[PDB]
Design a protein around this ligand. Sequence first.
Ligand SMILES: [Mg+2]
Ligand SMILES: [Mg+2]
Ligand SMILES: [Mg+2]
Ligand SMILES: [Mg+2]
Ligand SMILES: [Mg+2]
Ligand SMILES: [Mg+2]
Ligand SMILES: [Mg+2]
Ligand SMILES: [Mg+2]
Ligand SMILES: [Mg+2]
Ligand SMILES: [Mg+2]
Ligand SMILES: [Mg+2]
Ligand SMILES: [Mg+2]
Ligand SMILES: [Mg+2]
Ligand SMILES: [Mg+2]
Ligand SMILES: [Mg+2]
Ligand SMILES: [Mg+2]
Ligand SMILES: [Mg+2]
Ligand SMILES: [Mg+2]
Ligand SMILES: [Mg+2]
Ligand SMILES: [Mg+2]
Ligand SMILES: [Mg+2]
Ligand SMILES: [Mg+2]
Ligand SMILES: [Mg+2]
Ligand SMILES: [Mg+2]
Ligand SMILES: [Mg+2]
Ligand SMILES: [Mg+2]
Ligand SMILES: [Mg+2]
Ligand SMILES: [Mg+2]
Ligand SMILES: [Mg+2]
Ligand SMILES: [Mg+2]
Ligand SMILES: [Mg+2]
Ligand SMILES: [Mg+2]
Ligand SMILES: [Mg+2]
Ligand SMILES: [Mg+2]
Ligand SMILES: [Mg+2]
Ligand SMILES: [Mg+2]
Ligand SMILES: [Mg+2]
Ligand SMILES: [Mg+2]
Ligand SMILES: [Mg+2]
Ligand SMILES: [Mg+2]
Ligand SMILES: [Mg+2]
Ligand SMILES: [Mg+2]
Ligand SMILES: [Mg+2]
Ligand SMILES: [Mg+2]
Ligand SMILES: [Mg+2]
Ligand SMILES: [Mg+2]
Ligand SMILES: [Mg+2]
Ligand SMILES: [Mg+2]
Ligand SMILES: [Mg+2]
Ligand SMILES: [Mg+2]
Ligand SMILES: [Mg+2]
Ligand SMILES: [Mg+2]
Ligand SMILES: [Mg+2]
Ligand SMILES: [Mg+2]
Ligand SMILES: [Mg+2]
Ligand SMILES: [Mg+2]
Ligand SMILES: [Mg+2]
Ligand SMILES: [Mg+2]
Ligand SMILES: [Mg+2]
Ligand SMILES: [Mg+2]
Ligand SMILES: [Mg+2]
Ligand SMILES: [Mg+2]
Ligand SMILES: [Mg+2]
Lengths: 59, 117, 101, 138, 151, 113
Amino acid sequence: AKHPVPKKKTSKARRDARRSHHALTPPTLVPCPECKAMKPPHTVCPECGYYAGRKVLEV
Amino acid sequence: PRAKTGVVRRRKHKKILKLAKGYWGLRSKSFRKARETLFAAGNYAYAHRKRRKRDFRRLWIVRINAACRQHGLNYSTFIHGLKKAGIEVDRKNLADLAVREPQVFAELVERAKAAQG
Amino acid sequence: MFAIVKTGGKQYRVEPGLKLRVEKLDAEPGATVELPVLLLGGEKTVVGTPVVEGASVVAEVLGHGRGKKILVSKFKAKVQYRRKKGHRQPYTELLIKEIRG
Amino acid sequence: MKTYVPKQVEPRWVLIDAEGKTLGRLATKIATLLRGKHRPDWTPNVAMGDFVVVVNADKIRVTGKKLEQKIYTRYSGYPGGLKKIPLEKMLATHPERVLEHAVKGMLPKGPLGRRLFKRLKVYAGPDHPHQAQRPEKL
Amino acid sequence: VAYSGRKIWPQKHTGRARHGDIGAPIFVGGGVVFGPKPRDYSYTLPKKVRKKGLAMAVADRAREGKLLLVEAFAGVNGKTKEFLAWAKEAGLDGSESVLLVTGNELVRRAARNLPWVVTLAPEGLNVYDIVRTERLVMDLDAWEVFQNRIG
Amino acid sequence: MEAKAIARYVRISPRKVRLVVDLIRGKSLEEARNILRYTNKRGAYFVAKVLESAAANAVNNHDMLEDRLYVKAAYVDEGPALKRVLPRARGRADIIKKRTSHITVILGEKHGK
RNA sequence: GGGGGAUGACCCCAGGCGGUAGGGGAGCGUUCCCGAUGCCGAUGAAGGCCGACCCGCGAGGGCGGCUGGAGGUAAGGGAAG
RNA sequence: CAGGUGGAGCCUGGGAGUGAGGGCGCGAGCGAUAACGUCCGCGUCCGAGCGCGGGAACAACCGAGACCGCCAGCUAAGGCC
RNA sequence: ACCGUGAGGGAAAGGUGAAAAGAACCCCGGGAGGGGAGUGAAAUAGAGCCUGAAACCGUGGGCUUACAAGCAGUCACGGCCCCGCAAGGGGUUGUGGCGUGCCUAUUGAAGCAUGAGCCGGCGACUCACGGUCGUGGGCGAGCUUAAGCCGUUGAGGCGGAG
Ligand SMILES: [Mg+2]
Ligand SMILES: [Mg+2]
Ligand SMILES: [Mg+2]
Ligand SMILES: [Mg+2]
Ligand SMILES: [Mg+2]
Ligand SMILES: [Mg+2]
Ligand SMILES: [Mg+2]
Ligand SMILES: [Mg+2]
Ligand SMILES: [Mg+2]
Ligand SMILES: [Mg+2]
Ligand SMILES: [Mg+2]
Ligand SMILES: [Mg+2]
Ligand SMILES: [Mg+2]
Ligand SMILES: [Mg+2]
Ligand SMILES: [Mg+2]
Ligand SMILES: [Mg+2]
Ligand SMILES: [Mg+2]
Ligand SMILES: [Mg+2]
Ligand SMILES: [Mg+2]
Ligand SMILES: [Mg+2]
Ligand SMILES: [Mg+2]
Ligand SMILES: [Mg+2]
Ligand SMILES: [Mg+2]
Ligand SMILES: [Mg+2]
Ligand SMILES: [Mg+2]
Ligand SMILES: [Mg+2]
Ligand SMILES: [Mg+2]
Ligand SMILES: [Mg+2]
Ligand SMILES: [Mg+2]
Ligand SMILES: [Mg+2]
Ligand SMILES: [Mg+2]
Ligand SMILES: [Mg+2]
Ligand SMILES: [Mg+2]
Ligand SMILES: [Mg+2]
Ligand SMILES: [Mg+2]
Ligand SMILES: [Mg+2]
Ligand SMILES: [Mg+2]
Ligand SMILES: [Mg+2]
Ligand SMILES: [Mg+2]
Ligand SMILES: [Mg+2]
Ligand SMILES: [Mg+2]
Ligand SMILES: [Mg+2]
Ligand SMILES: [Mg+2]
Ligand SMILES: [Mg+2]
Ligand SMILES: [Mg+2]
Ligand SMILES: [Mg+2]
Ligand SMILES: [Mg+2]
Ligand SMILES: [Mg+2]
Ligand SMILES: [Mg+2]
Ligand SMILES: [Mg+2]
Ligand SMILES: [Mg+2]
Ligand SMILES: [Mg+2]
Ligand SMILES: [Mg+2]
Ligand SMILES: [Mg+2]
Ligand SMILES: [Mg+2]
Ligand SMILES: [Mg+2]
Ligand SMILES: [Mg+2]
Ligand SMILES: [Mg+2]
Ligand SMILES: [Mg+2]
Ligand SMILES: [Mg+2]
Ligand SMILES: [Mg+2]
Ligand SMILES: [Mg+2]
Ligand SMILES: [Mg+2]
């Protein structure tokens, strides 16, 4: 191996187009079955998680 | 006394980058590439000036030759007719004449068709 | 009812009440120049010759001028050769009044 | 006095028989029409052209030995991907395409040249789509 | 300049540019090239040119009617209040700058502080001073030695 | 009437934080609040704090009504860089820049007629 | 270059006017000095940022707006980091 | 001896730069009646006219010596499906 | 400081305001920071403080771009946006024509030959004494003083050895 190196400083155009996929996705949220707050699905809520099983108690 | 650069170089640079407004990438933002680009715009402008003169005539010609082929002849002959016919009043600039004043063109065709034979 | 007229090595199609910019000529402003030179009537069948004689068009000089500056530059790579000259091309303005048969 | 330039115009159509017409000689004009260098308002940067419809294109005829000897080549991208196709073969497989080709090569290159080529619609044998006017030209 | 003579870096194979001491003028903080050293701007004018020039510059004030000779003042006993009086009486209001040439220590120190007066012993008559001032004024003691200088 | 907050000299890299800012631009404060909690990034924490201080700023200082405000403008500019020496093989010693964010949330009131 | 006899900067007329090494000529600008015990300046110095405007062939100079907040420095000449 | 007033010529002086040339034509030598070879001669162009037109593109082949401007005209070489 | 065993090498780094009046108190916040409040002629003079350029990063707006290909410009026309009574201009770019970076070194470079990431600031024909020409003046069979002496708000004079 020798030492590949970039031959040309890349244009602001070009890096910024590289980044055209970099944008985030907002987290997918659903309203809590009991409590008022929003929760990502299929997760025991940070307040009073579930019914049949014993949730982590915020209650 | 010592005269340090001070304000001079910033000005000279600003002048040129101003000229370079709108140019792509660095060519607008870097005094060097600005200046380099400009040399080029400068000679193109000059050269393209002389050639705008060509660019236009060659348009006029296609337009004549087009209109008077309706009347059944060459641009080639048309001009010769008009040469003989004394009608050297040119044109080729006018040529809106062929577009905007068709009949006046047509008359001009006929003055042309009949000359020196 | 137009004309085709010859001023300063060029030709222009003029009508009455036409403000026309044209190569600069010797006149004081406000004076009237009949350019005895006229190449076509807008009546068709009157056409011909270098110039139809007796015809002329009257327009009066509206004042002279200098056009927006053109920067004419020259550069020659690798010879350290660069020239800058600004050029403003003097004109005169006319308003076209009478087309005279 | 600026030079006149068209406002948006009406796209005139035109019909051509091609049976017995030669090839490049038929092509020359089809080009001129496509550009519309026959129209006195002709503008280089716009393409106010005619649309051209050509029929009986299986029937173009040509001189000399070209039917056998004349070859169309196609390089794919690949080693030994240059394809060599004789006139007779073309006409027998895709008739026309030979006129489409001859005309295309005669149209200019660049964004606009490629547009004008869309305006030349070529068919084999008789008829075609009957939509527009299409004045027959000879 | 202060710094050492040491060679800043090998000069081949560092991949950097190539150098001597940092006192080199190409370096920020290094020596100056060809800038100023102490030197003597004086030269020797020909003496006849100074005579002529002295003479002519008086002449030029005379030719304008701006030159005045005076006897004895009486605005002596040097006080600028006393002078400023005689000045008025002699037609100098300080509307025009005045070069006062006299050997009288007392009149000189009188006029000295005026904004419109410059003042000189006669043996110190110089052309620069004449030309700067709108009007020349001498006493007759002064005019003598002025005349004895030229020729 | 708009209300703003600015965190200055936040020791985080602007590209990193800018990312979650675009996640809340134009959003109503209710979702903006919601998004930052479950957005998993270190810049979620800081932006949330600015957002909140700008919400507090709206209600107490500017009389703006907490239920009606959305994020109008939000942007991170880049403050001064902390430069540290990173020793390298063959004695080389590069320098990494620990960079710095200036975070800005601007709030305005959803028209809410 | 020739006339015009204003002694040029001014008007006619005729010419010449690609250029590297290089020779010659005229200008612009920066710092400092005299001009200055002056003049411009908080009704806003220098500097900065705009300008599609004016003058100059050009280097440049104006002018207007914004910023700036205490300096700047004609005409004409001198000297150079 | 005549024509020839030319960015001609001669004399005295100040300042240079250059002393790596190249292609092409013609005339020779060297070479193999090789080389985008080499060496001279006489000419030319590039050099410094990698400014313009022609030759697909192309320093030096053909055309032609670019002071500025014009949406005017005639031509050169080479061209006119 | 730092670097070197040592001799030795050897930096960066100035400026709020007239005055600290250097922002009580409240709010968000763990703090940092900021929002109000207040001070001030001014607070994008707020102490990471005069001015505050450029490269560089960013938010918002206008024009534009996903069947075109290129030293990035230029000439022309057209569209959309802005300024303007108008004519006119500014912006942007769709298509068309034209188009081989700058410097350097060379017979010859876009050159697949040298140098340059970009921006700011520093950076290279000087001065002394002789010489040789030219030029502006002074005096001309003459011209001219050196050291030094006197004298001076930055005053000049004398001095003839040479
Ligand atoms: Mg290995
Ligand atoms: Mg690998
Ligand atoms: Mg400098
Ligand atoms: Mg021509
Ligand atoms: Mg003709
Ligand atoms: Mg070139
Ligand atoms: Mg060269
Ligand atoms: Mg040593
Ligand atoms: Mg290297
Ligand atoms: Mg120093
Ligand atoms: Mg390591
Ligand atoms: Mg180690
Ligand atoms: Mg002339
Ligand atoms: Mg010349
Ligand atoms: Mg100074
Ligand atoms: Mg005030
Ligand atoms: Mg200054
Ligand atoms: Mg200002
Ligand atoms: Mg001054
Ligand atoms: Mg220097
Ligand atoms: Mg003779
Ligand atoms: Mg000669
Ligand atoms: Mg000589
Ligand atoms: Mg030799
Ligand atoms: Mg030769
Ligand atoms: Mg030779
Ligand atoms: Mg032959
Ligand atoms: Mg050879
Ligand atoms: Mg040979
Ligand atoms: Mg030769
Ligand atoms: Mg050379
Ligand atoms: Mg050539
Ligand atoms: Mg030559
Ligand atoms: Mg070339
Ligand atoms: Mg060619
Ligand atoms: Mg010439
Ligand atoms: Mg011919
Ligand atoms: Mg130690
Ligand atoms: Mg107040
Ligand atoms: Mg504040
Ligand atoms: Mg400010
Ligand atoms: Mg301030
Ligand atoms: Mg201050
Ligand atoms: Mg500041
Ligand atoms: Mg944007
Ligand atoms: Mg396609
Ligand atoms: Mg498209
Ligand atoms: Mg591409
Ligand atoms: Mg283009
Ligand atoms: Mg250079
Ligand atoms: Mg070399
Ligand atoms: Mg070499
Ligand atoms: Mg070589
Ligand atoms: Mg390359
Ligand atoms: Mg190499
Ligand atoms: Mg290179
Ligand atoms: Mg080399
Ligand atoms: Mg180089
Ligand atoms: Mg620089
Ligand atoms: Mg000397
Ligand atoms: Mg000398
Ligand atoms: Mg002399
Ligand atoms: Mg003394």
